[PDB]
Amino acid sequence: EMEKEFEQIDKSGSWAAIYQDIRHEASDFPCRVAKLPKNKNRNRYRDVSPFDHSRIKLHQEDNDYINASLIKMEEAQRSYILTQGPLPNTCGHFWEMVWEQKSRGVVMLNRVMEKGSLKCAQYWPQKEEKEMIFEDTNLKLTLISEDIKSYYTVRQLELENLTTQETREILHFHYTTWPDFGVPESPASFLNFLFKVRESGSLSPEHGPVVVHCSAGIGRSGTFCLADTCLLLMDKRKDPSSVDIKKVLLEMRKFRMGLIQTADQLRFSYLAVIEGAKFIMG
Ligand SMILES: CC(=O)N[C@@H](Cc1ccc(N(C(=O)C(=O)O)c2ccccc2C(=O)O)c2ccccc12)C(=O)NCCCCCOc1cc2ccccc2cc1C(=O)O
């Protein structure tokens, strides 16, 4: 089971210990392309890189690098592209990735500014009349509309390939209330956020994988993906309680390092899943 496991671990202050076990067991692969000197300014944090085997390649011939990994979950049949919050000089690359990968949705779990510093570039337009043009990748982005709510905001965007003049709609799911420190007391609003993302069909097979990111695209992003996959797995198995979340996290870490950066996020993950399963069946 996982239900009682949460009990044991929790009422034992075992979280910190487990997390470390995960860190210790996590896969270790080569990020050669990421550490090349010419890509130094394409990475936000020197200690957060994409494994070469699962990195996303840009379809340009100049430099196909971008700090982004493709988490491909075989059993749950779900794919996600986890990436770092774009840099002032990687916004064009970011949107080129969304286009080429035919993604339908972008999931953002942080604010442009947190703790007095920038955690992600303002990669999308804030006003309908002020559109953005990424000259280096020949892309145009326009804010069609947005729906601001209590703990999150959904925006409808129109991304256009200036080269072919082809337009495509993209949904921006911005969770705007993640706390300054630690994690949310309740996974409620986070769960509702995920469901809203599911409802849009952005996580579905007829589209390219969703693009998820916070600042490094491993911590909060990890909780998002992890919860989604674990929930989905519970929908597919005869015995839903057999879903071992550690096992799943470790499987995802084969595609990107660091997913879930603190014991808190690990606990929070357990919570959202557990509670999420309840809500679905009522
Ligand atoms: C130079 C510098 O400042 N680096 C920062 C970069 C950074 C990462 C995560 C954040 N975050 C996120 O959610 C996010 O944006 O993702 C948070 C982290 C902690 C708490 C809260 C948050 C939050 O935003 O809510 C950040 C938030 C703000 C600023 C910087 C954030 C950092 O902390 N590095 C530590 C190591 C992690 C990177 C690989 O780990 C590994 C690599 C391995 C490789 C191989 C094998 C085992 C390995 C094991 C590990 C491991 O330790 O698990």
Tab-separated table of C-alpha atoms and ligand atoms in Angstrom:
chain	number	residue	atom	x	y	z
A	1	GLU	CA	0.000	0.000	0.000
A	2	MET	CA	0.860	3.700	0.011
A	3	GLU	CA	-1.847	4.961	2.372
A	4	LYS	CA	-0.455	3.410	5.548
A	5	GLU	CA	3.089	3.898	4.289
A	6	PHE	CA	2.411	7.637	4.463
A	7	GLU	CA	1.321	7.023	8.030
A	8	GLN	CA	4.452	5.134	9.085
A	9	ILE	CA	6.959	7.375	7.322
A	10	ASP	CA	5.183	10.539	8.473
A	11	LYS	CA	4.765	9.704	12.153
A	12	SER	CA	8.443	8.681	12.164
A	13	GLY	CA	10.155	11.734	10.708
A	14	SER	CA	11.367	9.262	8.093
A	15	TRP	CA	10.950	11.658	5.160
A	16	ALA	CA	14.421	13.185	5.202
A	17	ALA	CA	15.926	9.697	5.324
A	18	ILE	CA	13.886	8.328	2.407
A	19	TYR	CA	14.548	11.346	0.198
A	20	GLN	CA	18.267	10.792	0.725
A	21	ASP	CA	17.814	7.134	-0.196
A	22	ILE	CA	16.231	8.341	-3.407
A	23	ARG	CA	19.070	10.775	-4.038
A	24	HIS	CA	21.531	7.940	-3.436
A	25	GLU	CA	19.702	5.502	-5.735
A	26	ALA	CA	18.891	7.969	-8.534
A	27	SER	CA	20.341	7.275	-11.998
A	28	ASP	CA	23.503	9.024	-13.151
A	29	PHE	CA	23.978	9.700	-16.900
A	30	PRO	CA	26.228	11.935	-19.099
A	31	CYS	CA	25.222	15.530	-19.840
A	32	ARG	CA	28.054	16.088	-22.309
A	33	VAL	CA	26.112	18.378	-24.637
A	34	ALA	CA	24.915	20.491	-21.690
A	35	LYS	CA	28.454	21.138	-20.429
A	36	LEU	CA	29.876	22.245	-23.772
A	37	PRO	CA	31.327	25.771	-23.442
A	38	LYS	CA	29.145	27.204	-26.223
A	39	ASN	CA	26.036	26.314	-24.231
A	40	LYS	CA	27.164	27.857	-20.977
A	41	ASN	CA	24.724	30.727	-21.454
A	42	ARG	CA	21.798	28.398	-22.275
A	43	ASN	CA	21.789	26.969	-18.765
A	44	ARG	CA	20.292	28.740	-15.747
A	45	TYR	CA	22.096	26.720	-13.102
A	46	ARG	CA	25.451	25.053	-13.659
A	47	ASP	CA	24.316	22.186	-11.415
A	48	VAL	CA	21.067	21.452	-13.327
A	49	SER	CA	21.572	19.781	-16.705
A	50	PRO	CA	19.651	17.496	-19.102
A	51	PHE	CA	21.010	13.958	-19.670
A	52	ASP	CA	22.173	13.591	-23.282
A	53	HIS	CA	20.064	10.487	-23.856
A	54	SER	CA	16.811	12.251	-23.100
A	55	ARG	CA	17.488	15.874	-24.039
A	56	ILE	CA	15.142	17.687	-26.408
A	57	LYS	CA	16.791	18.784	-29.628
A	58	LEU	CA	15.894	21.992	-31.453
A	59	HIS	CA	15.409	21.478	-35.186
A	60	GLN	CA	17.874	24.202	-36.109
A	61	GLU	CA	21.351	23.315	-37.404
A	62	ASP	CA	23.250	26.044	-35.553
A	63	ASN	CA	22.985	24.783	-31.955
A	64	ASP	CA	20.207	22.304	-31.132
A	65	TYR	CA	20.620	22.671	-27.380
A	66	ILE	CA	18.069	23.678	-24.798
A	67	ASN	CA	17.912	22.706	-21.146
A	68	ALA	CA	14.966	20.348	-21.422
A	69	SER	CA	14.323	16.665	-20.842
A	70	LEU	CA	11.649	14.290	-22.179
A	71	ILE	CA	10.227	12.165	-19.348
A	72	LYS	CA	8.641	9.200	-21.137
A	73	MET	CA	6.506	7.088	-18.840
A	74	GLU	CA	5.910	3.744	-20.554
A	75	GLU	CA	3.399	2.134	-18.180
A	76	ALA	CA	1.307	5.235	-17.563
A	77	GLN	CA	1.627	6.098	-21.263
A	78	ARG	CA	2.319	9.743	-20.604
A	79	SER	CA	5.091	12.062	-21.742
A	80	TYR	CA	6.289	15.384	-20.273
A	81	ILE	CA	8.967	17.861	-21.261
A	82	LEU	CA	10.490	19.342	-18.094
A	83	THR	CA	12.553	22.407	-18.763
A	84	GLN	CA	14.128	25.298	-16.834
A	85	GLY	CA	12.381	28.633	-16.723
A	86	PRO	CA	13.664	30.352	-19.921
A	87	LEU	CA	16.561	32.840	-19.830
A	88	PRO	CA	16.473	36.255	-21.543
A	89	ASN	CA	18.352	34.664	-24.424
A	90	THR	CA	16.501	31.308	-24.540
A	91	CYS	CA	12.898	32.483	-24.903
A	92	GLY	CA	13.048	32.041	-28.662
A	93	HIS	CA	14.470	28.531	-28.188
A	94	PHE	CA	11.746	27.776	-25.663
A	95	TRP	CA	8.943	28.648	-28.042
A	96	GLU	CA	10.748	26.911	-30.895
A	97	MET	CA	10.693	23.809	-28.732
A	98	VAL	CA	6.944	24.153	-28.042
A	99	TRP	CA	6.261	24.503	-31.763
A	100	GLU	CA	8.482	21.673	-32.990
A	101	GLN	CA	7.286	19.290	-30.291
A	102	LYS	CA	3.682	20.181	-31.123
A	103	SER	CA	2.949	20.842	-27.490
A	104	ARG	CA	-0.490	22.169	-26.659
A	105	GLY	CA	0.094	23.303	-23.089
A	106	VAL	CA	2.809	25.005	-20.989
A	107	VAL	CA	2.691	24.489	-17.215
A	108	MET	CA	4.391	27.134	-15.024
A	109	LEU	CA	4.738	26.577	-11.275
A	110	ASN	CA	6.596	29.740	-10.215
A	111	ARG	CA	6.509	33.532	-10.491
A	112	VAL	CA	8.775	35.639	-12.694
A	113	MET	CA	10.173	37.079	-9.478
A	114	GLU	CA	10.484	35.217	-6.202
A	115	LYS	CA	12.629	36.137	-3.197
A	116	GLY	CA	13.844	39.387	-4.727
A	117	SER	CA	15.372	37.895	-7.863
A	118	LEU	CA	14.323	36.661	-11.257
A	119	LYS	CA	13.435	32.988	-11.382
A	120	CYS	CA	12.306	32.928	-15.029
A	121	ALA	CA	12.231	35.413	-17.930
A	122	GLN	CA	8.902	37.033	-18.890
A	123	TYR	CA	8.601	34.738	-21.887
A	124	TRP	CA	4.979	35.551	-22.759
A	125	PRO	CA	3.049	38.816	-23.489
A	126	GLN	CA	1.169	40.426	-20.616
A	127	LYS	CA	-1.056	42.625	-22.793
A	128	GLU	CA	-3.200	41.683	-25.853
A	129	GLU	CA	-2.035	44.756	-27.814
A	130	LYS	CA	1.679	44.150	-27.087
A	131	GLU	CA	2.744	40.948	-28.872
A	132	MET	CA	6.216	39.365	-28.804
A	133	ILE	CA	8.454	38.441	-31.702
A	134	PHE	CA	11.383	36.079	-31.247
A	135	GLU	CA	13.503	37.068	-34.243
A	136	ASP	CA	16.098	34.358	-33.788
A	137	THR	CA	13.471	31.587	-34.169
A	138	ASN	CA	10.989	33.586	-36.271
A	139	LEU	CA	8.005	33.158	-33.953
A	140	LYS	CA	5.193	35.495	-32.884
A	141	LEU	CA	3.237	35.181	-29.652
A	142	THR	CA	0.036	37.036	-28.767
A	143	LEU	CA	-2.014	37.149	-25.571
A	144	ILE	CA	-5.549	36.283	-26.776
A	145	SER	CA	-7.048	36.245	-23.304
A	146	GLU	CA	-6.556	35.020	-19.751
A	147	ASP	CA	-8.703	33.875	-16.846
A	148	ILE	CA	-7.271	34.917	-13.477
A	149	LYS	CA	-8.357	32.956	-10.430
A	150	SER	CA	-7.512	32.553	-6.775
A	151	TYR	CA	-4.444	30.313	-6.921
A	152	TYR	CA	-3.764	30.032	-10.670
A	153	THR	CA	-4.198	31.687	-14.048
A	154	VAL	CA	-4.974	30.196	-17.448
A	155	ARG	CA	-4.027	32.080	-20.561
A	156	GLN	CA	-4.864	31.433	-24.185
A	157	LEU	CA	-2.004	32.269	-26.486
A	158	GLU	CA	-1.519	32.289	-30.192
A	159	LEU	CA	1.911	31.120	-31.306
A	160	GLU	CA	2.651	31.720	-34.994
A	161	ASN	CA	5.369	30.387	-37.262
A	162	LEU	CA	6.267	33.567	-39.157
A	163	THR	CA	8.115	31.467	-41.730
A	164	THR	CA	5.111	29.379	-42.763
A	165	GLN	CA	2.535	31.840	-41.387
A	166	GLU	CA	0.906	28.915	-39.604
A	167	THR	CA	-0.843	29.722	-36.304
A	168	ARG	CA	-1.537	27.456	-33.342
A	169	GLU	CA	-3.233	28.003	-30.009
A	170	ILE	CA	-1.399	27.330	-26.760
A	171	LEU	CA	-2.703	27.203	-23.229
A	172	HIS	CA	-0.521	28.615	-20.468
A	173	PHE	CA	-1.266	27.064	-17.078
A	174	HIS	CA	0.307	29.351	-14.494
A	175	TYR	CA	0.129	28.266	-10.880
A	176	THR	CA	0.647	31.633	-9.205
A	177	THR	CA	0.365	30.844	-5.497
A	178	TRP	CA	3.140	28.415	-4.626
A	179	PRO	CA	4.464	29.643	-1.226
A	180	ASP	CA	7.674	31.591	-0.722
A	181	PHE	CA	9.180	28.788	1.371
A	182	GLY	CA	8.339	25.106	1.651
A	183	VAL	CA	5.203	23.659	0.079
A	184	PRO	CA	1.416	24.305	0.301
A	185	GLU	CA	-0.225	23.182	3.580
A	186	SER	CA	-2.940	21.620	1.443
A	187	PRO	CA	-2.560	19.972	-1.988
A	188	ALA	CA	-6.152	20.955	-2.760
A	189	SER	CA	-5.522	23.915	-5.068
A	190	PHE	CA	-2.574	22.154	-6.683
A	191	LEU	CA	-4.802	19.152	-7.380
A	192	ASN	CA	-7.423	21.416	-8.916
A	193	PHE	CA	-4.714	22.974	-11.042
A	194	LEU	CA	-3.631	19.583	-12.406
A	195	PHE	CA	-7.223	18.623	-13.176
A	196	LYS	CA	-7.729	21.854	-15.050
A	197	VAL	CA	-4.643	20.978	-17.035
A	198	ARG	CA	-5.985	17.467	-17.676
A	199	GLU	CA	-9.394	18.790	-18.757
A	200	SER	CA	-7.814	20.921	-21.482
A	201	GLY	CA	-6.478	17.832	-23.211
A	202	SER	CA	-2.902	19.151	-22.949
A	203	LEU	CA	-1.734	15.930	-21.348
A	204	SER	CA	-3.367	13.832	-24.028
A	205	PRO	CA	-1.871	11.679	-26.841
A	206	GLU	CA	-3.163	13.661	-29.814
A	207	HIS	CA	-0.825	16.502	-28.838
A	208	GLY	CA	2.884	16.802	-28.253
A	209	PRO	CA	4.036	16.401	-24.636
A	210	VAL	CA	3.251	19.213	-22.255
A	211	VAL	CA	6.103	21.595	-21.279
A	212	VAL	CA	6.404	21.868	-17.483
A	213	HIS	CA	8.794	24.271	-15.712
A	214	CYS	CA	9.439	26.303	-12.600
A	215	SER	CA	12.921	27.808	-12.276
A	216	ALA	CA	15.226	24.772	-12.586
A	217	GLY	CA	12.402	22.539	-13.868
A	218	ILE	CA	13.061	19.740	-11.379
A	219	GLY	CA	11.576	20.602	-7.996
A	220	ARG	CA	8.014	21.848	-8.320
A	221	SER	CA	7.939	20.448	-11.831
A	222	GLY	CA	8.788	17.054	-10.410
A	223	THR	CA	5.820	17.116	-8.048
A	224	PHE	CA	3.494	17.996	-10.891
A	225	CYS	CA	4.609	15.171	-13.176
A	226	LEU	CA	4.940	12.694	-10.376
A	227	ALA	CA	1.446	13.288	-9.050
A	228	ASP	CA	-0.081	13.126	-12.513
A	229	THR	CA	1.664	9.876	-13.404
A	230	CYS	CA	0.926	8.180	-10.088
A	231	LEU	CA	-2.737	9.109	-10.290
A	232	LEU	CA	-2.951	7.895	-13.860
A	233	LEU	CA	-1.276	4.616	-12.874
A	234	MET	CA	-3.870	4.104	-10.152
A	235	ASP	CA	-6.508	4.344	-12.912
A	236	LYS	CA	-4.829	1.545	-14.845
A	237	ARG	CA	-4.155	-1.043	-12.176
A	238	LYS	CA	-6.364	-3.673	-10.625
A	239	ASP	CA	-4.741	-2.838	-7.302
A	240	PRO	CA	-4.359	0.974	-7.074
A	241	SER	CA	-2.495	0.815	-3.761
A	242	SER	CA	0.341	-1.151	-5.354
A	243	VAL	CA	1.591	2.038	-7.014
A	244	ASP	CA	4.946	2.715	-5.319
A	245	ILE	CA	5.617	6.420	-5.652
A	246	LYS	CA	9.358	6.123	-4.836
A	247	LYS	CA	9.655	3.545	-7.590
A	248	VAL	CA	7.942	5.958	-9.964
A	249	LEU	CA	10.070	8.943	-8.979
A	250	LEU	CA	13.199	6.871	-9.582
A	251	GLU	CA	11.857	5.868	-12.964
A	252	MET	CA	11.355	9.538	-13.875
A	253	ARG	CA	14.837	10.420	-12.657
A	254	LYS	CA	16.205	8.210	-15.401
A	255	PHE	CA	15.166	11.009	-17.741
A	256	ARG	CA	16.090	14.102	-15.697
A	257	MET	CA	18.172	14.606	-12.541
A	258	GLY	CA	16.913	16.104	-9.290
A	259	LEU	CA	13.140	15.657	-9.724
A	260	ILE	CA	11.714	16.509	-6.297
A	261	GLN	CA	14.430	18.554	-4.533
A	262	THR	CA	13.342	18.370	-0.881
A	263	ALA	CA	11.789	15.914	1.534
A	264	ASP	CA	8.934	18.395	1.763
A	265	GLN	CA	8.195	18.164	-1.929
A	266	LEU	CA	8.359	14.376	-1.578
A	267	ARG	CA	5.853	14.462	1.271
A	268	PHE	CA	3.688	16.912	-0.622
A	269	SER	CA	3.810	14.584	-3.597
A	270	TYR	CA	2.570	11.666	-1.525
A	271	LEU	CA	-0.213	13.896	-0.233
A	272	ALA	CA	-1.478	15.203	-3.553
A	273	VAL	CA	-1.570	11.691	-4.980
A	274	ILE	CA	-3.310	10.181	-1.984
A	275	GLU	CA	-5.828	12.973	-1.797
A	276	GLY	CA	-6.194	13.101	-5.563
A	277	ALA	CA	-7.230	9.463	-5.748
A	278	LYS	CA	-9.921	10.128	-3.165
A	279	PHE	CA	-11.379	13.085	-4.987
A	280	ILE	CA	-11.681	11.232	-8.290
A	281	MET	CA	-13.873	8.489	-6.796
A	282	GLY	CA	-15.577	10.849	-4.343
B	1	LIG	C1	23.697	26.942	-8.426
B	1	LIG	C2	22.318	26.919	-7.769
B	1	LIG	O1	21.915	27.875	-7.107
B	1	LIG	N1	21.627	25.768	-7.997
B	1	LIG	C3	20.283	25.587	-7.434
B	1	LIG	C4	19.259	25.433	-8.613
B	1	LIG	C5	17.815	25.269	-8.119
B	1	LIG	C6	17.261	23.960	-8.121
B	1	LIG	C7	15.956	23.730	-7.664
B	1	LIG	C8	15.105	24.800	-7.172
B	1	LIG	N2	13.814	24.426	-6.732
B	1	LIG	C9	12.819	24.076	-7.700
B	1	LIG	O2	11.716	23.627	-7.402
B	1	LIG	C10	13.059	24.243	-9.211
B	1	LIG	O3	13.031	25.315	-9.762
B	1	LIG	O4	13.316	23.100	-9.869
B	1	LIG	C11	13.583	24.300	-5.303
B	1	LIG	C12	14.552	23.549	-4.548
B	1	LIG	C13	14.462	23.348	-3.165
B	1	LIG	C14	13.396	23.890	-2.446
B	1	LIG	C15	12.420	24.630	-3.118
B	1	LIG	C16	12.470	24.858	-4.525
B	1	LIG	C17	11.328	25.668	-5.034
B	1	LIG	O5	11.509	26.506	-6.073
B	1	LIG	O6	10.246	25.562	-4.524
B	1	LIG	C18	15.633	26.148	-7.159
B	1	LIG	C19	14.835	27.249	-6.680
B	1	LIG	C20	15.364	28.574	-6.669
B	1	LIG	C21	16.688	28.821	-7.129
B	1	LIG	C22	17.495	27.744	-7.605
B	1	LIG	C23	16.993	26.392	-7.633
B	1	LIG	C24	20.201	24.396	-6.436
B	1	LIG	O7	19.390	24.442	-5.516
B	1	LIG	N3	21.048	23.346	-6.662
B	1	LIG	C25	21.051	22.154	-5.789
B	1	LIG	C26	21.176	20.768	-6.509
B	1	LIG	C27	20.003	20.329	-7.410
B	1	LIG	C28	20.281	19.751	-8.846
B	1	LIG	C29	20.654	18.269	-9.127
B	1	LIG	O8	20.476	17.369	-8.008
B	1	LIG	C30	20.895	15.996	-8.117
B	1	LIG	C31	21.626	15.503	-9.260
B	1	LIG	C32	22.036	14.146	-9.358
B	1	LIG	C33	22.752	13.715	-10.521
B	1	LIG	C34	23.165	12.353	-10.633
B	1	LIG	C35	22.870	11.422	-9.590
B	1	LIG	C36	22.155	11.835	-8.420
B	1	LIG	C37	21.727	13.208	-8.295
B	1	LIG	C38	21.003	13.670	-7.151
B	1	LIG	C39	20.590	15.042	-7.063
B	1	LIG	C40	19.851	15.440	-5.873
B	1	LIG	O9	20.317	16.175	-5.054
B	1	LIG	O10	18.621	14.931	-5.748
